[PDB]
């Protein structure tokens, strides 16, 4: 069955001979499983999808069920048009029926195929749900101890469930999410790094939404386990755990407090210095949403020693991370007490804040100018606007603020004329 032409495949599949059909279907599976440019479109154009779908129902011939499930999985793994071809052939209910197969390799292949279909987007995700995929998928995981399942099998099930949680506009149906969540909570406590990664991905999808969606997850009590995973040595686990945590702190002050209460801030010295740029960026974004909170939450950032780390990232990091750090500072100075703001200055925030005013990015300039105005307002309550002015002049900051008067964007030049006119 190695390297058949599509023509030969079609000839075998159209024979009236189940064993010839099986050999031809296996040949198609092998063509479709090759590394360079599997001929998906040629297979579709040859009209083979409906035949493959009909073979999924051949309970009397489990091998042709497996070969066809694998072939269709690989077509469904392609472009949206290729996945559509599979759905249009009636594959969804046929795959759901195979979830009950007594052959674990066939059940697993149906799980995989449904994952690709759901992974296409919200419409197919929702269509898979409407055809009734969730109940039988979850039934495969209803065992006293997940460790008794084959590892590859459990990984595929977790990945497919994660795709049922994925995508927005719209988000998945609330009742589907409520149905899946208890199983996800259990997977988040499993000891396999790929299951943990995909479970965290699932949770990151579910929390990427308005406070009602975040609340559904938070009330299941998973925040402490997410915080534990945030400290994993495996980057593929840290990345989604951090995205999930970052999503949660975009919600209410009370939701944000659960993240703090669970000990998340103790991990941030490491995250804010992580050698992976994207982790530092996401960690700083998360910090910016925490400093946007209440004064008692800003105080926790202070107590955990995180202000020096924010000064660090502002001083030296990838520019996108520096931009998140600027936001973290503007939010802090906007919501913080006078004493908290004084502390920020004492940690050395001014010089690196001023250095960033050379940035070729009008948004970060607006943000920094806002922060400076906030700091001056605190300085006023203390009658110390003069010490701050000298600090800004000393590190070359005044040179930068005056230049910004000649800035194209209207918001920059106004904000900075104000600073010059009032404090310099």
């Amino acid at each position: 069955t190695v390297n058949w032409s599509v023509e030969d495949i079609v000839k075998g599949i159209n024979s009236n001979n189940l064993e010839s059909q099986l050999q031809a279907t296996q040949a198609a599976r092998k063509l479709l499983s090759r590394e360079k440019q599997p001929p998906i479109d040629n297979i579709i154009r040859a009209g083979l999808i409906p035949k493959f779908v009909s073979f999924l129902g051949k309970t009397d011939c489990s091998p042709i069920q497996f070969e066809s499930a694998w072939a269709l999985t690989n077509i469904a793994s392609g472009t949206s048009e290729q996945t559509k071809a599979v759905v249009d052939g009636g594959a969804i209910p046929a795959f759901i029926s195979l979830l009950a197969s007594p052959h674990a390799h066939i059940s697993e292949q149906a799980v995989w195929a449904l994952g690709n279909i759901a992974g296409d987007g919200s419409a197919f995700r929702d269509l898979v749900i409407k055809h009734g995929a969730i109940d039988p998928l979850l039934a495969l995981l209803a065992v006293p101890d997940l460790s008794t399942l084959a590892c590859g099998y459990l990984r595929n099930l977790t990945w497919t469930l994660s795709n049922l949680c994925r995508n927005k506009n719209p988000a998945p149906p609330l009742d589907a999410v409520e149905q899946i969540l208890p199983t996800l909570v259990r997977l988040l406590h499993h000891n396999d790094p790929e299951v943990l990664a995909d479970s965290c991905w699932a949770i990151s999808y579910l929390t990427d939404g308005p406070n009602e969606r975040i609340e559904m997850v938070v009330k299941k009590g998973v925040v402490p386990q997410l915080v534990k995973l945030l400290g994993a040595t495996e980057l593929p686990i840290v990345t989604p755990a951090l995205r999930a945590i970052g999503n949660i702190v975009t919600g209410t002050d009370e939701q944000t407090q659960k993240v703090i209460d669970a000990g998340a801030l103790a991990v941030f010295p490491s995250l804010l210095t992580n050698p992976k740029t994207n982790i530092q960026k996401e960690a700083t974004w998360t910090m910016s949403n925490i400093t946007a909170g209440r004064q008692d939450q800003i105080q926790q950032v202070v107590n955990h020693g995180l202000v020096p780390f924010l000064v660090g990232v502002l001083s030296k990091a990838d520019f996108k991370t520096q931009k998140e750090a600027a936001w973290a500072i503007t939010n802090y100075t906007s919501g913080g007490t006078v004493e908290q703001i004084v502390y920020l200055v004492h940690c050395g925030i001014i010089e690196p804040l001023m250095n960033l005013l050379s940035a070729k990015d009008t948004k970060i300039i607006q943000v920094i100018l806002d922060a400076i105005s906030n700091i001056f307002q605190a300085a006023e309550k203390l009658g110390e606007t003069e010490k701050l002015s000298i600090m800004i002049e000393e590190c070359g900051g005044l040179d930068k603020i005056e230049a910004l008067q000649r800035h194209e964007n209207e918001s920059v030049y106004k904000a900075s004329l104000n600073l010059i006119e009032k404090y310099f």
């Binding site: 499983s33 090759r34 590394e35 599997p38 694998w70 999985t73 690989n74 469904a76 793994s77 392609g78 996945t83 292949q109 995989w112 994952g115 690709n116 992974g119 296409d120 990945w159 994660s162 795709n163 994925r166 990664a197 995909d198 991905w201 990427d208 980057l235 593929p236 990345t239 989604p240 995205r243 970052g246 999503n247 702190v249 975009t250 919600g251 994207n278 974004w285 910016s288 949403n289 946007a292 936001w327 939010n331 906007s334 919501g335």
Partner: peptide, 16 residues
């Protein structure tokens, strides 16, 4: 109010 919303898991996988 001052909150700002926002290496991936693949959406589709081919069995090789």
């Amino acid at each position: 109010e001052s909150k700002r919303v926002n290496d991936s898991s693949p959406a589709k996988k081919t069995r090789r």
